[PDB]
Design a protein around this ligand. Structure first.
Ligand SMILES: [Ca+2]
Ligand SMILES: [Ca+2]
Length: 88
């Protein structure tokens, strides 16, 4: 269903759920997710996310298909996100 993004690593701090969809920087902000703040993400079965360093779904990126306690180079550097349903 949804992925849950956290402000700090190891699933700590402020958290927000994101169902499938495309989210620009402004759309993330409207959902209470400040720019370049995500540090960890939970990804349950059936969904995946593509985190982008730039708004508009562009730039360096990372595809998460399972829980990620940390994001390496994209830590506090995500500006847009696409959450995608992967049925099985
Ligand atoms: Ca953070
Ligand atoms: Ca960014």
């Amino acid at each position: 269903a949804n992925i849950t993004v956290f402000y700090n690593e190891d699933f700590q701090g402020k958290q927000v759920d994101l169902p499938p969809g495309n989210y620009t920087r402004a759309q993330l902000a409207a959902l209470g997710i400040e720019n370049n703040t995500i540090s960890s993400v939970k990804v349950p079965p059936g969904v995946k996310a593509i985190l982008y360093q730039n708004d508009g779904f562009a730039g360096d990126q990372i595809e998460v298909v399972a829980n990620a306690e940390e994001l390496g180079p994209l830590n506090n550097n995500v500006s847009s996100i696409r959450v995608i349903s992967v049925p099985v």
